[PDB]
Amino acid sequence: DTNQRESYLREQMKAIQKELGGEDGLSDLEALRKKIEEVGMPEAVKTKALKELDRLERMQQGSPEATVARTYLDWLTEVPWSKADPEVLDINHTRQVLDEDHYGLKDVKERILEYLAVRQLTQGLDVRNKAPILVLVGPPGVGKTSLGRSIARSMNRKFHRISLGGVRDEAEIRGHRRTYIGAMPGKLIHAMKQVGVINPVILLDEIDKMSSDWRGDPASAMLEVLDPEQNNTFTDHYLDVPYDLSKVFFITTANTLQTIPRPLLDRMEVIEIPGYTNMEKQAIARQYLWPKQVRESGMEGRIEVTDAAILRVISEYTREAGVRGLERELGKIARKGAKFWLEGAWEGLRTIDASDIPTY
Amino acid sequence: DTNQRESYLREQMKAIQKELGGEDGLSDLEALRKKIEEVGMPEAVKTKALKELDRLERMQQGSPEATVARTYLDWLTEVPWSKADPEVLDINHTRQVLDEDHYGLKDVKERILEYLAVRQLTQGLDVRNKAPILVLVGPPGVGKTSLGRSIARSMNRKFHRISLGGVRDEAEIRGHRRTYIGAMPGKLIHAMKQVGVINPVILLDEIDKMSSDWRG
Amino acid sequence: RLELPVIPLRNTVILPHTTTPVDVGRAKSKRAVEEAMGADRLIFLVAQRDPEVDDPAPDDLYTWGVQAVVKQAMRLPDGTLQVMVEARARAQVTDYIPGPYLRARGEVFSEIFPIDEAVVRVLVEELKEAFEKYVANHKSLRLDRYQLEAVKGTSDPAMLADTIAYHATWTVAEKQEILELTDLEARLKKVLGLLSRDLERFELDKRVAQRVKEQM
Amino acid sequence: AMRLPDGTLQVMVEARARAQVTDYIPGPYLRARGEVFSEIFPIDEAVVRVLVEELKEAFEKYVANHKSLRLD
Ligand SMILES: Nc1ncnc2c1ncn2[C@@H]1O[C@H](COP(=O)(O)OP(=O)(O)OP(O)(O)=S)[C@@H](O)[C@H]1O
Numbered sequence A: 001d002t003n004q005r006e007s008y009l010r011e012q013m014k015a016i017q018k019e020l021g022g023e024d025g026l027s028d029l030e031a032l033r034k035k036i037e038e039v040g041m042p043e044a045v046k047t048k049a050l051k052e053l054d055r056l057e058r059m060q061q062g063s064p065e066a067t068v069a070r071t072y073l074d075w076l077t078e079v080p081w082s083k084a085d086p087e088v089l090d091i092n093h094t095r096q097v098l099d100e101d102h103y104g105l106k107d108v109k110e111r112i113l114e115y116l117a118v119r120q121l122t123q124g125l126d127v128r129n130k131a132p133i134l135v136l137v138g139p140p141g142v143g144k145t146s147l148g149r150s151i152a153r154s155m156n157r158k159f160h161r162i163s164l165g166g167v168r169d170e171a172e173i174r175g176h177r178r179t180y181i182g183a184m185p186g187k188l189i190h191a192m193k194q195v196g197v198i199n200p201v202i203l204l205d206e207i208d209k210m211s212s213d214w215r216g217d218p219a220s221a222m223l224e225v226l227d228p229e230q231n232n233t234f235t236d237h238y239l240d241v242p243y244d245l246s247k248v249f250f251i252t253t254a255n256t257l258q259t260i261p262r263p264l265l266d267r268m269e270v271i272e273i274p275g276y277t278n279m280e281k282q283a284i285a286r287q288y289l290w291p292k293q294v295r296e297s298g299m300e301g302r303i304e305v306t307d308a309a310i311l312r313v314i315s316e317y318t319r320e321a322g323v324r325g326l327e328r329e330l331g332k333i334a335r336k337g338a339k340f341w342l343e344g345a346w347e348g349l350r351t352i353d354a355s356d357i358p359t360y
Numbered sequence B: 001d002t003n004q005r006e007s008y009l010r011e012q013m014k015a016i017q018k019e020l021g022g023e024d025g026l027s028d029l030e031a032l033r034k035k036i037e038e039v040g041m042p043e044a045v046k047t048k049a050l051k052e053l054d055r056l057e058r059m060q061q062g063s064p065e066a067t068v069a070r071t072y073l074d075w076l077t078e079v080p081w082s083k084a085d086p087e088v089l090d091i092n093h094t095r096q097v098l099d100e101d102h103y104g105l106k107d108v109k110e111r112i113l114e115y116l117a118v119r120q121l122t123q124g125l126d127v128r129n130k131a132p133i134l135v136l137v138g139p140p141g142v143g144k145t146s147l148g149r150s151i152a153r154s155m156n157r158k159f160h161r162i163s164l165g166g167v168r169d170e171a172e173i174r175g176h177r178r179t180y181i182g183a184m185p186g187k188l189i190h191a192m193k194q195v196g197v198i199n200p201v202i203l204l205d206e207i208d209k210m211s212s213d214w215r216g
Numbered sequence C: 001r002l003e004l005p006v007i008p009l010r011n012t013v014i015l016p017h018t019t020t021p022v023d024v025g026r027a028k029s030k031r032a033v034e035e036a037m038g039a040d041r042l043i044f045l046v047a048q049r050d051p052e053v054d055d056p057a058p059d060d061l062y063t064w065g066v067q068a069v070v071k072q073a074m075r076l077p078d079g080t081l082q083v084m085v086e087a088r089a090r091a092q093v094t095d096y097i098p099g100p101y102l103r104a105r106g107e108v109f110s111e112i113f114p115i116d117e118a119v120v121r122v123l124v125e126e127l128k129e130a131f132e133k134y135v136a137n138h139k140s141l142r143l144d145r146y147q148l149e150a151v152k153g154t155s156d157p158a159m160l161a162d163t164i165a166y167h168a169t170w171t172v173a174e175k176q177e178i179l180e181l182t183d184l185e186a187r188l189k190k191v192l193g194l195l196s197r198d199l200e201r202f203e204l205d206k207r208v209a210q211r212v213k214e215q216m
Numbered sequence D: 001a002m003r004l005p006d007g008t009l010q011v012m013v014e015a016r017a018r019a020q021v022t023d024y025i026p027g028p029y030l031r032a033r034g035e036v037f038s039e040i041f042p043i044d045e046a047v048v049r050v051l052v053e054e055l056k057e058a059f060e061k062y063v064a065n066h067k068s069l070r071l072d
Helices: A002-015 A030-038 A043-054 A064-078 A092-100 A109-121 A144-155 A187-193 A219-226 A278-296 A307-316 A324-342 B002-019 B043-055 B067-078 B092-100 B108-119 B144-154 B187-194 C027-036 C117-137 C157-167 C173-180 C186-215 D045-064
Strands: A135-137 A159-162 A201-204 A249-253 A270-272 B161-163 B203-205 C020-022 C042-048 C061-073 C083-092 D002-004 D008-010
Touching (some): A002 B002, A030 A043, A092 A144, A144 A159, A144 A201, A144 A249, A159 A187, A187 A201, A307 A324, B002 B043, B002 C186, B067 B187, B144 B203, B161 B203
Parallel strands (some): A135 A270, A201 A249
16 A cells, blocks of 8 residues: 555646646646747757757756756746847937937937947848947946947837956856756846847946956957857857857947957947036036936925036035036935925925035 | 636645655645635735646655745745835934934934935835935944844834845855755845735845855 | 424535435434424424534524425334425524524525516526536536436426535535525526536546546 | 605606706796707608617617626
8 A cells, every 4th residue: 555555646746737736837847848839949959958858857856957957948948039129220219319318428429320320221130240339438427328228228129237347257157067056157148038038239337347367268258249240159158059149239338448358359349438527517417417316315396406506516526527426416415405304394495505515 | 716626626635645655745735725825915926826736746855846835835925925014104203213222423313314304205106216225334343233223113114134244145145946945045035034024124234244255 | 484393404404395305313303303293294494504513502503494394204213213304495594592402483485586587497497407417427426317307397496496406516505605595596696606616626537537647 | 646655755757858947946946947848859760760679689688688687
């Protein structure tokens, strides 16, 4: 009875197939095979998938190798295959966006609007480009990230970003070959995993801030994803089949010309980003900075500052080149305005002149 | 019909699980199924629990898929869902609380006034932040966590402490997918399973004493 | 009727207009049997709860008492007085008079015939076909053929309704909810829904039965 | 008409026609002005008869859609 009744219990724990509950997953990784089939994948990916799915269903318990194999299966299926985005095939919308939201960027938006125009002149939107991918160089916090977000909004494809600065090896740009629980791909595969389409607008953060010493040089991997003739055959260390990276746009950022590595310095379009002047940041603070401090700290129509006091702030509370320091000062003004308003609203609309600034 | 047929699955397989040769599940798949579909928690819990049914009906001893079904089920259920403490929204209350709990330098008190006075203006038909998160810097000996529990008591919220000087990877704060026990979930969901409401104050201790020892 | 003797029913409520056996094993019910043969063969049958206390209680009864005209009453020397009762209709129980033997007064029959009887006859024919399908399919789960034979050739809709509701096997709470429903169509809708639920768990039994041969 | 024993005036009437109130005489009791009849007789009775038959079929469907919400 101990053998036969337990065998019939095995018959029950498979033969119920969880019924209504089993409808989802179809008995543990039938639905993952279904989702291999559902996602339109390259054929080498599908052969690797079906092969290592046959490496699965092998008594998962007592085998964390089957756990990391199902993990690899998830990455394979979750990675977006044949899922695109609508684009904009005009340069006019990018003109209206970067004339609209970001205060012209003083002249250099047109040097961007030539690059996007040249990119949309390339016929068929073909894989070969032999072309640069628009590096941005400039002192920190000058709108470059929101510049890329704007360019993707004009593109009407979703922006993304990954702070790749400070990484010491290739082992999390390519991942590593699977051997245990906790096996992980590169950061780029994480990035395009949390982007559910196969043609995003990817913005690199700190290529010049990469570090090298041990566990393989990631500069090979950035070079391998760098060239449009090369990123189409970018393969992994976690994954196997080379991934197609032609449709994926790569805006990149940096901070220093002279510490980006030599294979990543050639074939690149250098844009030296400027920093809005005092009065230009005054104009910025008047319409897109202090209004957002007002709109996020919840004080619309309940406070105001004179712009000579904004001159007093920029001349006295922020000597950084960018706007993040001025953003922090205007945040502190927003917070002390919230306190001095929640002390009892003495006015229906406050008045911040240049006098009481070391009181707010 | 789906719920009653799954209840028929509950009834048949609770009659089945009593004599299992798979014993580390302890026949508690249907015992904890009372909060799979007789649950007063949202359709995230319902859909997760429907997949837990697919994660039941499995054996044990070494990497069990059904023990991790019930451990995951408890983790989802024990973690509060749409359960909230009544939090008092007052700032002068905190002026008394920080007067009754500390001697005070009377300087940082103004800073938490700044932040909480912003917190009084949480608008937009919800509570959305886009705001700083109060880094506290200074000696360890100074009553920082005392200040935090003062703020938590001032807000009628459950103070906790999980420290991040002791995490080296995204496996002590991130999880692993529920297919084996011996995967143990992270610190914030540890502290959130500790609390019975979905809204605690959490103070973080010594963020600067963290390192990337292993890959990641 | 009023102040008639009360016999607690054995393990299930006896629905009207079905030839059923009623066991009388306890002496406290035997005294009310001896009283009920002094009431012109008419018994106000009030059922007790599913855990049958050995003596009838003035708090464990049900709120519906059925009046039964005794076709014949045979006595047996084994200790059980099996009585052949053919009941008429449910009636409400106002309150409980303690015994033993128990007494409970009622009123006129709660079965009513409302307007729009064409819909009533359509529902009777639909429920007759659905119960014929339920009886013909449930040969594996032991549904009898005399139960299907005893529901053919009925004059009142209450005849077929209560007889079919007795001839299908489910719990006591659903039968109590049926006897609460004095409407002529709501009882038919309830029986149709319960038959659909039983046929769907029956389908669930064949689903697990296919995956029996699959996964063997 | 007749008088109910509980203190209610019960009257069985059939309405004649619609009218428009021009001026309101103050009350109580209330007074109304208007016309003796302002109804419109059917013209082009083929479409009217088609509409009557369609309304009859739609009302038959409406009363036939009830299963536990019975109507007279
Ligand atoms: N033309 C502009 N130049 C600089 N900052 C701007 C400009 N337009 C808007 N901003 C503000 O810039 C802030 C966010 O961007 P920044 O701090 O300038 O830089 P970032 O894009 O966040 O990071 P970078 O520039 O890539 S290092 C917001 O508060 C915007 O209001």
